[PDB]
Amino acid sequence: DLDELKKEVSMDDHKLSLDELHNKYGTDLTRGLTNARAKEILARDGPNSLTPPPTTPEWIKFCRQLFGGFSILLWIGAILCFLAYGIQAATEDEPANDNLYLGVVLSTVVIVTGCFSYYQEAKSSRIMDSFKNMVPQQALVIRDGEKSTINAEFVVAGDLVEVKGGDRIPADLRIISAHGCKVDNSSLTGESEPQTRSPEFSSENPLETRNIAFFSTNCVEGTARGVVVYTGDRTVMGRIATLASGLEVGRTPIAIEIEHFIHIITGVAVFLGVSFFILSLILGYSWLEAVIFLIGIIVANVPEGLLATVTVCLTLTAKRMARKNCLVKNLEAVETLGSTSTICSDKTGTLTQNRMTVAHMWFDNQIHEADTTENQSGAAFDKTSATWSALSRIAALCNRAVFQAGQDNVPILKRSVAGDASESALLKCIELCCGSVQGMRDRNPKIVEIPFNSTNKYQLSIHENEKSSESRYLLVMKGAPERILDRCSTILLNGAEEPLKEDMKEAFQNAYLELGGLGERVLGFCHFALPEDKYNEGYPFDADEPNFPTTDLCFVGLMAMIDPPRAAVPDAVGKCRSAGIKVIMVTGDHPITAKAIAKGVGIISEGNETIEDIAARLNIPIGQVNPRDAKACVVHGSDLKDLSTEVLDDILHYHTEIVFARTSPQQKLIIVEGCQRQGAIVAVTGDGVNDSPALKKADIGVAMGISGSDVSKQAADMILLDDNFASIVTGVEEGRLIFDNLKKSIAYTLTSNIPEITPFLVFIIGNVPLPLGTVTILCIDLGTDMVPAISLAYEQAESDIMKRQPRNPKTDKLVNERLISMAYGQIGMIQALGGFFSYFVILAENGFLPMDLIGKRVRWDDRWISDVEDSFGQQWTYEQRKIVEFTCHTSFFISIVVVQWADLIICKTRRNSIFQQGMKNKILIFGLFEETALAAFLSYCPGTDVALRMYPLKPSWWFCAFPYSLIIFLYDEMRRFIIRRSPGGWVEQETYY
Amino acid sequence: EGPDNDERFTYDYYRLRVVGLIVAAVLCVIGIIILLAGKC
Amino acid sequence: GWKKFLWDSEKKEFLGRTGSSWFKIFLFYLIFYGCLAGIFIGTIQVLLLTLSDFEPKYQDRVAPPGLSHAPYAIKTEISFSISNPKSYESFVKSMHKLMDLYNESSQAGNSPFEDCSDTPADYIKRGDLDDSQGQKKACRFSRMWLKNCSGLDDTTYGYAEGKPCVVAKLNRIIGFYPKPLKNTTDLPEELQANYNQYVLPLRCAAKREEDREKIGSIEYFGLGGYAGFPLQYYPYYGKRLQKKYLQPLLAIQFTNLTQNMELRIECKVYGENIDYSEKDRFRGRFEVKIEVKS
Numbered sequence A: 001d002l003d004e005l006k007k008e009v010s011m012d013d014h015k016l017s018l019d020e021l022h023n024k025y026g027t028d029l030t031r032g033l034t035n036a037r038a039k040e041i042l043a044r045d046g047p048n049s050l051t052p053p054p055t056t057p058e059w060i061k062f063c064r065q066l067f068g069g070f071s072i073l074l075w076i077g078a079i080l081c082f083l084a085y086g087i088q089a090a091t092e093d094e095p096a097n098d099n100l101y102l103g104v105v106l107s108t109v110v111i112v113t114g115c116f117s118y119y120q121e122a123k124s125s126r127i128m129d130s131f132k133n134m135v136p137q138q139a140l141v142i143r144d145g146e147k148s149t150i151n152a153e154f155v156v157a158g159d160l161v162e163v164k165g166g167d168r169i170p171a172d173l174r175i176i177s178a179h180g181c182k183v184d185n186s187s188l189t190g191e192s193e194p195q196t197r198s199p200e201f202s203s204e205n206p207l208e209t210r211n212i213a214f215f216s217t218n219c220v221e222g223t224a225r226g227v228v229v230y231t232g233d234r235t236v237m238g239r240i241a242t243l244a245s246g247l248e249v250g251r252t253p254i255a256i257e258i259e260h261f262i263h264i265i266t267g268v269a270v271f272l273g274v275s276f277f278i279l280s281l282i283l284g285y286s287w288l289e290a291v292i293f294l295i296g297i298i299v300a301n302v303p304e305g306l307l308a309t310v311t312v313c314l315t316l317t318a319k320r321m322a323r324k325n326c327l328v329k330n331l332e333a334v335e336t337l338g339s340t341s342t343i344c345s346d347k348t349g350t351l352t353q354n355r356m357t358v359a360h361m362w363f364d365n366q367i368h369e370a371d372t373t374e375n376q377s378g379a380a381f382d383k384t385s386a387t388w389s390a391l392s393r394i395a396a397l398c399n400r401a402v403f404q405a406g407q408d409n410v411p412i413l414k415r416s417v418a419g420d421a422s423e424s425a426l427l428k429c430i431e432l433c434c435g436s437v438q439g440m441r442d443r444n445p446k447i448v449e450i451p452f453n454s455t456n457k458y459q460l461s462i463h464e465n466e467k468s469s470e471s472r473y474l475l476v477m478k479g480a481p482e483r484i485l486d487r488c489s490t491i492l493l494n495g496a497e498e499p500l501k502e503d504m505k506e507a508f509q510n511a512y513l514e515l516g517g518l519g520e521r522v523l524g525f526c527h528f529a530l531p532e533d534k535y536n537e538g539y540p541f542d543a544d545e546p547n548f549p550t551t552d553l554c555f556v557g558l559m560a561m562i563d564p565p566r567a568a569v570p571d572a573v574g575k576c577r578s579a580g581i582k583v584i585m586v587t588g589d590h591p592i593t594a595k596a597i598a599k600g601v602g603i604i605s606e607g608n609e610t611i612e613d614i615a616a617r618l619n620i621p622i623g624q625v626n627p628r629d630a631k632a633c634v635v636h637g638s639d640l641k642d643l644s645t646e647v648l649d650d651i652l653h654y655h656t657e658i659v660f661a662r663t664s665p666q667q668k669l670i671i672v673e674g675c676q677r678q679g680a681i682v683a684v685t686g687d688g689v690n691d692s693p694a695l696k697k698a699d700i701g702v703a704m705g706i707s708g709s710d711v712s713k714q715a716a717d718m719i720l721l722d723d724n725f726a727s728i729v730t731g732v733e734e735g736r737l738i739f740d741n742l743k744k745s746i747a748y749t750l751t752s753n754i755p756e757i758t759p760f761l762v763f764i765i766g767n768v769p770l771p772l773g774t775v776t777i778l779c780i781d782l783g784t785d786m787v788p789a790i791s792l793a794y795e796q797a798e799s800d801i802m803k804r805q806p807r808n809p810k811t812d813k814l815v816n817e818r819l820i821s822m823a824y825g826q827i828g829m830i831q832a833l834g835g836f837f838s839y840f841v842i843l844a845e846n847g848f849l850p851m852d853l854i855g856k857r858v859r860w861d862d863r864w865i866s867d868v869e870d871s872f873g874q875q876w877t878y879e880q881r882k883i884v885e886f887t888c889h890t891s892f893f894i895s896i897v898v899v900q901w902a903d904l905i906i907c908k909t910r911r912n913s914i915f916q917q918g919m920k921n922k923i924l925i926f927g928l929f930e931e932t933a934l935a936a937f938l939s940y941c942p943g944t945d946v947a948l949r950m951y952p953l954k955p956s957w958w959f960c961a962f963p964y965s966l967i968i969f970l971y972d973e974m975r976r977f978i979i980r981r982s983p984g985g986w987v988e989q990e991t992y993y
Numbered sequence B: 001e002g003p004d005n006d007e008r009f010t011y012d013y014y015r016l017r018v019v020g021l022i023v024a025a026v027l028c029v030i031g032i033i034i035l036l037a038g039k040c
Numbered sequence C: 001g002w003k004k005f006l007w008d009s010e011k012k013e014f015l016g017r018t019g020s021s022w023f024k025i026f027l028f029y030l031i032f033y034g035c036l037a038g039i040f041i042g043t044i045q046v047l048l049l050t051l052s053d054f055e056p057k058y059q060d061r062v063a064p065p066g067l068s069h070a071p072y073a074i075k076t077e078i079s080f081s082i083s084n085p086k087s088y089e090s091f092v093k094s095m096h097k098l099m100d101l102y103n104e105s106s107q108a109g110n111s112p113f114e115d116c117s118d119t120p121a122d123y124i125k126r127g128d129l130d131d132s133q134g135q136k137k138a139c140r141f142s143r144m145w146l147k148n149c150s151g152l153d154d155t156t157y158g159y160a161e162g163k164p165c166v167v168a169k170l171n172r173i174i175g176f177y178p179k180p181l182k183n184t185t186d187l188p189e190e191l192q193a194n195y196n197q198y199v200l201p202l203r204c205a206a207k208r209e210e211d212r213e214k215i216g217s218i219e220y221f222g223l224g225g226y227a228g229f230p231l232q233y234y235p236y237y238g239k240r241l242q243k244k245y246l247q248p249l250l251a252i253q254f255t256n257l258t259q260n261m262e263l264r265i266e267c268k269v270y271g272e273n274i275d276y277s278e279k280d281r282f283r284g285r286f287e288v289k290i291e292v293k294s
């Protein structure tokens, strides 16, 4: 799978002859191949079917979810716990099982997190499998001089293949004979209108010539013949799909942030461990013990509930997205939208609707605009003049297309119409504001019609007049406005008729250039009442000689048409630009149309100008103007092929409104890479196969759901099942909101670390009884704490999020030193002091004063000293003193919950005050209530002092942590005050997360 | 008091546990009330 | 990166800040932590003002007293060879440490010691738990009372020829009055003979029914010759109100002990305000695993 030979732009053998072609692959132009020869080739190289994707077993991704960056940290933690247990078992008798419990718990945490994340990605895969609807297809091949329809998988290189309007081009053909055949090259090349296929050659670029049919394309109208030049995976879209599959994946921004977070957590963990390992070796302890101390300190500094909390956090924002029809295949792709700063979009199928629609109409020397929006939510065009009625009769009659049988259910715009795209657009507009065309057509019987001619350049026909008072004959004709203008002498103004003096002739010229400059295609409609005296009701006007007056007709008005963009496209583009997101158009369509659509969706703001526009406004050559005075630029693909790396960097560095036109898929990929080389996140939004290499290499791909291709849909990361473009704006908003929330929850789960470690440090340095046990730390990290941290995600915005500039990736991180200074430095310290306070209180009330506790651990732990004197002289057995130590663990845990109340409240808001935002978050309130009920339940339920070792507390103890909590609340309140009044001051660059 | 000062070494932990459970239960209910208050 | 974040020469920064910044952060943390320390200290002083010096507010975790002994057994086992002297040294050393506090030289004068009934007697109340009267007075407990286990005659105390001793002791509790079982028809078998009301009985036996036969004659030594604790040595007024206070002791000689075999001996005290616990094996009773292997 040579990638460089796949990265190269397509080459071909188009510039040849029919004899050279038949001489190179071997084939009869009039008899085709022989069946024996056909099978010899079929078996010689392979069926004309693309290879299947590389199946992914479910155990592989399950093992994937069991690993990663966070789960790996928890894995090493469990390993360390079992190592310390082994050492304690082989070195001392009666080894405590604390470490073995902590290790099996960490392993269970990793396994549960993996099961949940895996289940979600599987859910998305199932709903994703319900979209591949593959109905077999059979082609028409001519062998031994006979026509046969065989499965698409049996076509080989060399046989003759015939196509008909409505069928799909099987393989890559070389047209040999055509009959007004047109094909839809929108998915592969990106051409909105139907390009006519002809046996003759026209352009050096194979994608532009008409003598080549392509894979996955469809023949709109006409029939054609051709020799199969390319077959199977070796086809154009085959090489494109193989290239897409042979591209790397990358590494999202959220993953990098979690990685740097673990980097800091391990830095401070190994620092505290190697340092207290030297201090213990200086205070007397032995090596065997110091090793256990090192492992214990490095494990206590690891957040276990953070993994589950972060997972649930990310999972919550994805449901909100699934409620508005935005599905993500992975789980972290939900945050990439908020961090995006440059959106590369596609035009055909993404920025537009890929459907021709009547845009502007000319009548009564006045331009009228029609509604060109999917759901028909706009302004009518004043249907009260007679002119409009005559226009409706002209277009509705002089038109041969008709809705496809059985569409009585779909809407007027989404139904299937058999015919050209112009007659279809006209039929839809008439059927839209003029009622049923089928009755309008049967109301006037068509007598004789002269089909569109290459010389006449017009389409005309005569029908009877439904006027019950006028039995005359009606003649209507449509065609190019210039040709029709040369055939009139009257004008239907407001109903009456008038001459064609030069005043209206010039008004018609300006109208023609107005509709033309708008990137639209205009047509002219005229009619005339045939005198029943010179052509009675019985005379038959056979289409042979001049039976109708070509000139002296009555011109009624022009009718333009063009493909309109999707409903929420302009608003969404404007919203993205408002958020500081650079919108760059990347499409393979004609620049004359791309520029107009750009000036219509917001990419090229009205007023900005290109170098050619300046040269045209001044009437001077283009090589004289300076390119710095032009904000927007249109880069052509042909020119893009010959450009250096620095030139592209400068193109993106100096032009704010860039539009890449006529760019190949490979060039699209090159553009995405050119955007990444600097340092910004990229989001590519597309629909066809040409977008597959662009959606894959981009930081985040957005594929359309209804109008998208299967390859680009399988290679994208986010799918728009409703094809709504405003969803991009919604996504960029949610991506930010859940970011500020992740910061708040992380500071919350990190603040409790200090009051969970300090006890052991003072235990080794000061020799006091153990203040915080292991089953209590587990009841705080994995229990109570989970609901509040999960609730911190439901927090609303503080200021307008859709107003601030995009976050800088090189400077504004997710976890900075400003957070560590708060959680580990100021709040956690107060919480630890409160815990020690409740501790000393419990031991002072039972008889052990603070002066006699320093220096007792050796005898307080000894299991054979049944006479330990306290500060008053009483003798305490071993189990009696242990019961008190456990009750001290229970109260320490309750103190933690009490201080967590004020921590969850000060963590709710990062800058604003509580009396401003408000406690409208019902989940947080529920978290506090549940957090308290669980602590009371774990202490007061019978049999807990046996199972978990937590004894009941005396009602006067529960109030030892209250002052510390209020103090935490007041300190953070005054903190979040100087930041507001003093913007940019010390409190901001020192404590503002 | 004096010799029969047995009460000086007794504590009614039973009644304390009963009350602490009643309270825990109440707090739990109130919590649920607040949580579902709005979805009806 | 590596080098710059360490020392750049344009902004004259070290580790990130200039000379003046590290000072702002250090000064802030010093003031902050100083306030934290002062607050914690104040909240601890009010606590010192809340407790009393002559009595523990809560005395429920020590209601049923324990029963400890003089030898320090690692797993409540006494195993030693009658030949090798460096085998029972850990025992004699402890025993000695315990009896070394009942030396007569320590107990001398009128203060703060007082001569009490040579025969078991009743309680003695030296007033309330106050400082009005000065340091209360405690009864004297002589070594010699313990006859064959006193280290005054056979320093080793028995361990020298297969006849070890075990000095039992009742855990000291403030304001605790020991109360013995009354003479009514319900009383254990053992306790009937020698019912001196004023004596708290201590009686050892064998854990299993089999071991009875292998344990010989349990000879107890005590005040008055009884196997118990005289009620006159209570109550205990606490260290502050009764420094230089001695708690009664009871010696137990396990004469005629079968050789080369592990014997499980459970000693138990009997009384009203005495209750045992299936979890704490030292509450009221105690277990010893003697094995005189020679």
Ligand SMILES: *[C@@H]1O[C@H](CO[C@@H]2O[C@@H](C)[C@@H](O)[C@@H](O)[C@@H]2O)[C@@H](O[C@@H]2O[C@H](CO)[C@@H](O[C@@H]3O[C@H](CO[C@H]4O[C@H](CO)[C@@H](O)[C@H](O)[C@@H]4O)[C@@H](O)[C@H](O[C@H]4O[C@H](CO)[C@@H](O)[C@H](O)[C@@H]4O)[C@@H]3O)[C@H](O)[C@H]2NC(C)=O)[C@H](O)[C@H]1NC(C)=O
Pocket (backbone or CB within 6 Å): C100, C101, C103, C105, C106, C151, C152, C155
């Ligand atoms: C409480 O009483 C303890 C015993 O008191 C003795 O008996 C009472 C009834 C009175 O008569 C009293 O006056 C007696 O002293 C008392 O402990 C005793 O303290 C002395 C002084 O250190 C010890 O004497 C020394 O003995 C060692 C060898 O001891 C051997 O036996 C003991 C067991 O008894 C073993 O533990 C040892 O390991 C040995 O196996 C001598 O080597 C040592 O020599 C020193 O003195 C000589 C002159 O005699 C000098 O030439 C040397 O240079 C040395 O300076 C002493 O002779 C005595 O052993 C010890 N008794 C016991 C049982 O340990 C205790 O201190 C008192 N405590 C309080 C708080 O009042």
Ligand SMILES: CCCCCCCC/C=C\CCCCCCCC(=O)OC[C@H](COP(=O)(O)OCC[N+](C)(C)C)OC(=O)CCCCCCC/C=C\CCCCCCCC
Pocket (backbone or CB within 6 Å): A264, A268, A758, A761, A762, A765, A810, A811, A813, A815, A816, A817, A820, A824, A825, C015, C016, C026
């Ligand atoms: C029994 C007793 C109990 C004991 C309990 C102890 C509990 C432990 C509590 C806290 C642990 C503290 C450990 C250190 C934490 C430092 C945080 C840290 O390393 O965070 C990482 C930051 C990175 O941040 P960023 O990503 O935003 O950078 C972006 C840079 N861009 C954008 C320019 C490229 O790196 C930085 O900050 C740069 C590194 C600065 C390192 C400073 C080291 C100070 C440590 C000790 C000082 C002690 C002196 C005492 C004497 C005072 C004089 C009287």
Ligand SMILES: CCCCCCCC/C=C\CCCCCCCC(=O)OC[C@H](COP(=O)(O)OCC[N+](C)(C)C)OC(=O)CCCCCCC/C=C\CCCCCCCC
Pocket (backbone or CB within 6 Å): A901, A902, A905, A914, A915, A916, A917, A918, A919, A920, A925, A928, A929, A932, A962, A963, A965, A966, A969, B027
């Ligand atoms: C000595 C002991 C020390 C203890 C220290 C720890 C304390 C931590 C616990 C509680 C702290 C409570 C702090 C009180 C803050 C009240 C703030 C407040 O009232 O601000 C008013 C807000 C603002 O409104 P607005 O103008 O934006 O509205 C606009 C409406 N429009 C849009 C229609 C116009 O109004 C709103 O938020 C809407 C109404 C919300 C009402 C909330 C009431 C619930 C409050 C607390 C729950 C209790 C938790 C107890 C935990 C213990 C469990 C056992």
Ligand SMILES: CCCCCCCC/C=C\CCCCCCCC(=O)OC[C@H](COP(=O)(O)OCC[N+](C)(C)C)OC(=O)CCCCCCC/C=C\CCCCCCCC
Pocket (backbone or CB within 6 Å): A941, A942, A943, A944, A946, A947, A948, C279
């Ligand atoms: C929206 C949905 C709402 C759902 C809310 C659900 C809330 C559920 C509320 C209550 C159910 C809790 C479990 C009930 C346990 C009953 C245990 C029991 O009745 O024990 C009685 C006996 C004690 O007898 P004794 O006094 O003679 O013993 C003397 C022992 N001496 C003398 C040797 C010291 O027990 C024994 O003997 C053996 C003790 C066995 C230990 C079992 C305890 C289980 C341990 C951990 C599980 C707790 C996890 C936390 C789950 C939180 C969920 C929110």
Ligand SMILES: CCCCCCCC/C=C\CCCCCCCC(=O)OC[C@H](COP(=O)(O)OCC[N+](C)(C)C)OC(=O)CCCCCCC/C=C\CCCCCCCC
Pocket (backbone or CB within 6 Å): A101, A775, A778, A779, A782, A783, A784, A946, A947, A948
């Ligand atoms: C959504 C909100 C959830 C809230 C729930 C709170 C989360 C809790 C998180 C972590 C706590 C789990 C830690 C497990 C501790 C096991 C302790 C253990 O195994 O100790 C072994 C003890 C032996 O003790 P010893 O040597 O003194 O015996 C001496 C006996 N002699 C002397 C008489 C012979 O044996 C015994 O206690 C025998 C009785 C066995 C008791 C097993 C209790 C298991 C408790 C929890 C496991 C299920 C939790 C799942 C919920 C997850 C929530 C996310």
Ligand SMILES: CCCCCCCC/C=C\CCCCCCCC(=O)OC[C@H](COP(=O)(O)OCC[N+](C)(C)C)OC(=O)CCCCCCC/C=C\CCCCCCCC
Pocket (backbone or CB within 6 Å): A913, A915, A970, A973, A974, A977, A980, A981
């Ligand atoms: C032992 C002592 C006990 C004392 C108890 C005292 C209780 C007092 C009760 C209520 C307090 C008064 C209500 C405050 C209402 C203020 C309304 C208001 O308009 O506020 C606005 C100002 C913020 O203005 P700004 O210019 O920064 O806005 C900048 C906005 N931008 C950024 C868009 C430009 O807000 C602020 O100043 C808020 C700053 C207030 C900080 C004081 C905190 C008081 C401490 C605890 C309160 C008690 C709650 C817990 C109950 C425990 C029960 C045991």
Ligand SMILES: CCCCCCCC/C=C\CCCCCCCC(=O)OC[C@H](COP(=O)(O)OCC[N+](C)(C)C)OC(=O)CCCCCCC/C=C\CCCCCCCC
Pocket (backbone or CB within 6 Å): A830, A833, A964, A967, A970, A971, A974, A975, A978, A984, A985, A986, A987, A989, C024, C027, C028, C031, C032, C035, C036, C039, C040
């Ligand atoms: C049991 C637990 C108890 C805990 C109680 C804790 C109480 C301690 C609270 C605060 C004490 C710390 C005060 C430190 C003062 C020295 C700091 C200093 O040297 O600062 C210098 C700066 C002035 O330099 P600059 O910005 O002009 O230079 C610009 C330079 N460039 C560019 C780097 C920004 O100072 C400034 O900015 C002014 C900022 C001053 C900091 C205000 C923080 C106030 C926080 C809390 C007070 C509320 C206590 C409520 C307790 C109620 C108890 C019931």
Ligand SMILES: CCCCCCCC/C=C\CCCCCCCC(=O)OC[C@H](COP(=O)(O)OCC[N+](C)(C)C)OC(=O)CCCCCCC/C=C\CCCCCCCC
Pocket (backbone or CB within 6 Å): A954, A955, A956, B011, B012, B013, B015, B016, B019, B023
């Ligand atoms: C905005 C957020 C609202 C949040 C509301 C949450 C709802 C709170 C729910 C329940 C709390 C009430 C608890 C009442 C329980 C009393 C039960 C009782 O019988 O308990 C007696 C103990 C005395 O025990 P002992 O050891 O002496 O005897 C032990 C004797 N043995 C053991 C031998 C039997 O006493 C105790 O537990 C004392 C019980 C604690 C006293 C409550 C203190 C309230 C604190 C602040 C609230 C102030 C509100 C001011 C109004 C402002 C309006 C604008």
Ligand SMILES: CCCCCCCC/C=C\CCCCCCCC(=O)OC[C@H](COP(=O)(O)OCC[N+](C)(C)C)OC(=O)CCCCCCC/C=C\CCCCCCCC
Pocket (backbone or CB within 6 Å): A933, A934, A937, A941, A942, B013, B014, B017, B018, B021, B022, B024, B025, B028, B029, B032
């Ligand atoms: C949508 C609306 C939802 C509403 C739901 C409402 C749920 C119902 C709410 C409350 C139910 C209250 C039940 C009260 C039970 C009292 C049991 C009790 O007082 O037992 C105490 C005694 C044990 O005393 P001890 O002498 O061994 O003490 C130790 C003495 N030393 C250690 C010094 C020797 O019990 C014993 O002997 C026998 C114990 C037998 C086992 C009883 C099982 C109780 C366990 C859990 C039930 C509590 C759940 C409450 C809901 C909390 C939600 C988080």
Ligand SMILES: *[C@@H]1O[C@H](CO)[C@@H](O[C@@H]2O[C@H](CO)[C@@H](O)[C@H](O)[C@H]2NC(C)=O)[C@H](O)[C@H]1NC(C)=O
Pocket (backbone or CB within 6 Å): C216, C217, C256
């Ligand atoms: C101490 O135990 C010994 C047994 O070890 C008792 O003496 C034995 O008595 C039986 C008769 O019942 C004789 O057959 C043995 O020969 C005796 N053995 C020895 C070593 O004397 C002795 O009576 C016990 N003494 C006490 C006071 O319990």
Ligand SMILES: CC(C)CCC[C@@H](C)[C@H]1CC[C@H]2[C@@H]3CC=C4C[C@@H](O)CC[C@]4(C)[C@H]3CC[C@]12C
Pocket (backbone or CB within 6 Å): A932, A936, A955, A958, B016, B017, B019, B020, B023, B024
């Ligand atoms: C919002 C703020 C001010 C509310 C503060 C509520 C505090 C005071 C409440 C929350 C839970 C409560 C405790 C819940 C359970 C018990 C056990 C019971 O046997 C005695 C009361 C006691 C100890 C309560 C005392 C008051 C208490 C601590």
Ligand SMILES: CC(C)CCC[C@@H](C)[C@H]1CC[C@H]2[C@@H]3CC=C4C[C@@H](O)CC[C@]4(C)[C@H]3CC[C@]12C
Pocket (backbone or CB within 6 Å): C035, C038, C039, C041, C042, C045
């Ligand atoms: C709000 C903050 C900054 C106030 C902190 C006040 C500090 C400095 C005060 C509060 C309580 C005070 C203590 C109260 C009691 C005593 C006992 C006395 O025998 C020596 C002084 C000493 C030890 C005091 C030292 C100073 C102290 C700790």
Ligand SMILES: C[C@]12CC/C(=N\OCCN)C[C@@H]1C(=O)C[C@@H]1[C@@H]2CC[C@]2(C)C(=O)CC[C@@H]12
Pocket (backbone or CB within 6 Å): A096, A098, A099, A102, A292, A296, A297, A299, A300, A301, A302, A303, A304, A760, A772, A773, A774, A777, A781
């Ligand atoms: C350090 C610790 C395990 C880790 C721990 N918390 O882990 C939470 C992870 N965030 C704290 C525990 C303690 O304080 C007690 C520690 C225990 C390891 C085993 C230890 C060191 C012992 O042999 C006795 C004390 C035990």
Ligand SMILES: [Mg+2]
Pocket (backbone or CB within 6 Å): A186, A190, A346, A347, A348, A349, A350, A686, A687, A688
């Ligand atoms: Mg497209």
Ligand SMILES: [Mg+2]
Pocket (backbone or CB within 6 Å): A249, A250, A695, A696, A697, A698, A699, A700, A701, A716, A717
């Ligand atoms: Mg991707």
Ligand SMILES: [Mg+2]
Pocket (backbone or CB within 6 Å): A300, A302, A303, A304, A752, A753, A756, A777, A781
């Ligand atoms: Mg923790």
